[PDB]
C-alpha cells in the first residue's frame, strides 16, 4: 500500500467516526510519530482556524487536497449552508480525501473537484454555481500560487474582501507569489509566522566495533 492508504487506515482504526477533531488528531499523531507527510499540520492549522472564525466564509476554495487534512480542518468550522470546494489533480489522493471527509462526517459540506486547478478554475462559476469566493486556501505545487491567483482574478472569482491564505510562503517558499501580493495595491497582506509541521526527524549514530579480519 501507499503512505496515504496507511494514513487513512490509521484514521479508520483510531479516530472516532463523525468527529472531525478526532480525525485531525489521528493524522497529526501518525505523521508526527511514524511518517512525515505534507499536511499543513496542527500549528499552522490553529492559525487557519482563527482566520476562518474571524471571517466566517460561506464559500471557500482549496487548492490541493492531498489526504483531506486541511479540508477537514476548514469544513468543521463552517456555518450551516456554507461550502468548501477542493481541487486535487491526483486521483489516488482525491480518493483518500473523499474517504477522510466521509469518515469525519463532513461529506455534505465539501465537494472534491478532480483535476488541475488551471483547468478547473475557469469552470467554477458555471459548473459549481459560484459567484465570488469568500476565501481561498493555497497549498498546491508552489509554482502555481501566482498563476492561479491571476487566473482567479481573470475569471472574476475575487471580490473586495476575498481572503487568500497561502501555506509555505517561507519553506519550501513561494517567492514570486509573495513578492507579487506584497507589492500589489490590489492585496493587503499579513504574515503569520509558524513552523513546518512533522519536523521531529529521527536519526541516529551507529557504533561499529572492529573485531578483526
Ligand atoms: C501539500 S499537499 C496539500 C495538503 C493539504 N492542503 C492539507 O493541508 O491537508 C499538495 C497537493 O496539491 C496537488 N496539486 C499540485 N498541483 C495541483 C494543481 N495545479 N491543481 C490541483 N491539485 C494540485 C498535489 O497532488 C497534492 O495533493
Ligand atoms: O516539502 N515540504 O516540506 C512541503 C511542505 C508543505 O506544507 C507542502 O505543501 C509541500 N508541497 O506542497 O510540496 C511540501
Ligand atoms: Mg503546505
Author numbering: 3 to 215
Paste lines from the article.
Gel filtration chromatography showed two different oligomeric states for COMT. The WT monomer showed significantly lower re values of +31 % (1 a), +48 % (1 b), and +33 % (1 d) compared to +84 % (1 a), +59 % (1 b), +87 % (1 d) for the dimer. Unlike with monomeric WT COMT, the β7 strand exchange between the two subunits that occurs in the dimer maintains the overall Rossman fold tertiary structure; however, E199 and Y200 lie on the β6–β7 interconnecting loop, which is pulled out of the active site as a result of domain swapping, thus leading to loss of the E199–substrate interaction. The X‐ray crystal structures of dimeric Y200L and WT COMT revealed that a key residue (E199) had been flipped out of the active site. We rationalize that in the WT monomeric enzyme, E199 can form a hydrogen bond with the aldehyde group of 1 a, thereby leading to some para‐methylation, whereas in dimeric Y200L and WT COMT the absence of E199 from the active site results in the aldehyde group orientating towards the solvent, thereby leading to meta‐methylation. Since monomeric Y200L is as regioselective as the dimeric forms (ca. +90 % re), we suggest, based on the structural data for the Y200L and WT dimers and the regioselectivity assay data for both oligomeric forms, that loss of para‐methylation is largely due to movement of E199 out of the active site, as a consequence either of mutagenesis (Y200L) or protein dimerization and domain swapping (WT). The physiologically relevant form of COMT in vivo may be the dimer, since mainly meta‐methylated catecholamine metabolites are found in urine and liver samples. However, another explanation is that the hexa‐His tag that we introduced at the C‐terminus may have contributed to domain swapping and dimerization.
One example where the lack of enzyme regioselectivity limits potential commercial productivity is the engineered biosynthesis of the flavor and fragrance agent vanillin 2 a.3 Catechol‐O‐methyltransferase (COMT) has been used to methylate 3,4‐dihydroxybenzaldehyde (DHBAL, 1 a) and 3,4‐dihydroxybenzoic acid (DHBA, 1 b) in engineered strains of Escherichia coli and fission yeast for the production of vanillin 2 a from glucose. However, the lack of regioselectivity of COMT results in a mixture of 2 a and the undesired para‐methylated isovanillin 3 a, which are difficult to separate. Structural and mechanistic information suggest that the regioselectivity of COMT can be attributed to the concerted action of a “hydrophobic wall” found in the active site of the enzyme, and the substrate properties. The orientation of the R group in the active site determines whether the meta‐ or para‐hydroxy group is methylated.
